[PDB]
Specification:
The complex is a heterotetramer, with two copies of chain A (about 240 residues) and two copies of chain B (about 5 residues). By secondary structure, chain A is an all-alpha fold. Chain A is built from nine helices and no strands. In chain B, about 0% of the residues lie in helices and about 0% in strands. The chains are: A mainly alpha (about 240), B little secondary structure (about 5). Bound molecules: the ligand N=C(N)c1cc(-c2cccc(NC(=O)C3(Oc4ccc(Cl)cc4)CCNCC3)c2)cs1 (2 copies) and magnesium ion (6 copies). Chains A, C: This is 14-3-3 protein sigma.
Chain lengths: ~240, ~5, ~240, ~5
């Protein structure tokens, strides 16, 4: 741990500075260092962790998609052989992506999830576990693809079960979990009907609970509801 | 690509 | 050299792939590897090198500016002491920026400039030398600041002298050199009048030579002329 | 910031 000599509070401060500077790789390294101090994370700290890694992995996924598209074109009938470079570089980006996902999954397993007892933390971490298994599934092509898919599904399902028992239907973590599990169904598990059903049921149940919310909570919940509707519009 | 958060 | 085992042509191919994937750190590493093969660079290869490092250093400069602005605010009268974290992180980003600039300057000195005999390559490399000394000057505050400024000025001046003898006034490398040397005068050397004079003379001399150009060359030259005019509008 | 290339 290169961050082992820095105070936990200094790591959190620097993560916030790195965010302002759009240095998300630094942000993620600082938050990994903070997690490795061994104390549970507050709400704000959990979101700093997730923002950092989402930005890092998101850039890697975008690059992998560009490279995969070029590679599939080099493999069409009538393309000019270019040698191994496209495959090799796609593999390099893929391996770095897998490493980031393994790092995040490792932090969740050592020991964020096992110490998370409140629904807001436990659902958040299990959603992340499903998300990072989902990113692994996006690039998986081997003996382990089915097992990676089932690991994502299992994490999302445990998060869903807790969220339905312990959170209101408008809770933004519950909504974002459902949004992402719906995407898992559509894009990973070849279950578009389940994806659509989940998005629509989640939206309708949240709609009926908006009346209980303050103006600020209403803004937070309806923002995620709009993403559910956006996906439903894309899919129907 | 669909929206995720 | 981590790239020493990869073929030069494969490094160039991967630099192009990295560009398409917006992986500019990878792009720069591949182009550094290509330069270290020891052969002169073609026109396209020189531009791949410059694009890669410009994007890397540009992100670092943007982050440094954000951090420097936060730091200066923490130092105003009536700010709450926060400890060393803002300074430390600004210093970290600064040191990484300096390292990138030293890497580029090292490639130019070993041995791109000494082997560049044609004006299009030599002016291009000397412009880059001025640019990377300029980025070093942007963060310099010590015994060496004046010397770093003079190193930038000397590189730009040698490039200017060659460009005026060997290139037409519409040559985009000549125009971009003048654009950047004008910015050096304004932002680094505290010489706004020289900056304005250089931009205006460069623009007017290019205007008078546009009639010699094809439609494609005209587009290339007038794009850079518009940047000169944009800066003149900012400064007057 | 002014334009450079
Ligand atoms: N970035 C920082 N320094 C900080 C960010 C936060 C924080 C705390 C709680 C919620 C949010 N909410 C979100 O980031 C968004 O919503 C969601 C909704 C659901 C989920 Cl599971 C994740 C995120 C993301 C998508 N668009 C709407 C907001 C942020 C504290 S500090
Ligand atoms: N990127 C790639 N894979 C490749 C890029 C090139 C290439 C070759 C010659 C010129 C350009 N020109 C430029 O990039 C711009 O112009 C200038 C103008 C002057 C200067 Cl000294 C630098 C750049 C940049 C600013 N906006 C207009 C164009 C590119 C070949 S391959
Ligand atoms: Mg301590
Ligand atoms: Mg692989
Ligand atoms: Mg169900
Ligand atoms: Mg060879
Ligand atoms: Mg320093
Ligand atoms: Mg002069």
């Amino acid at each position: 741990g290169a961050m082992g000599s820095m105070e936990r509070a200094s790591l959190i401060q620097k993560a916030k500075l790195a965010e302002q500077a759009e240095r998300y790789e630094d942000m993620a390294a600082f938050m990994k260092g903070a997690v490795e101090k061994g104390e549970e994370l507050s709400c704000e700290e959990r979101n700093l962790l997730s923002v950092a890694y989402k930005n890092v992995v998101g850039g890697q996924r975008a690059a992998w998609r560009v490279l995969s598209s070029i590679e599939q074109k080099s493999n069409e009938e009538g393309s000019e052989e270019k040698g191994p470079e496209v495959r090799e570089y796609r593999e390099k980006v893929e391996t770095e992506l897998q490493g980031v996902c393994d790092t995040v999954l490792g932090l969740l397993d050592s020991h964020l999830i096992k110490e998370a007892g409140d629904a807001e933390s436990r659902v958040f971490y299990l959603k992340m576990k499903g998300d990072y298994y989902r990113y692994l599934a996006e690039v998986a092509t081997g003996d382990d693809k089915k097992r990676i898919i089932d690991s994502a599904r299992s994490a999302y399902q445990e998060a869903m079960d807790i969220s339905k028992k312990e959170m209101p239907p408008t809770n933004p973590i519950r909504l974002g979990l459902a949004l992402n599990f719906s995407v898992f169904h559509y894009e990973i598990a070849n279950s578009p009907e389940e994806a659509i059903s989940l998005a629509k049921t989640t939206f309708d149940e949240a709609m009926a609970d908006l009346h209980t919310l303050s103006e600020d909570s209403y803004k937070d919940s309806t923002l995620i509801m709009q993403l559910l509707r956006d996906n439903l519009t894309l899919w129907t | 690509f669909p929206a995720t958060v």
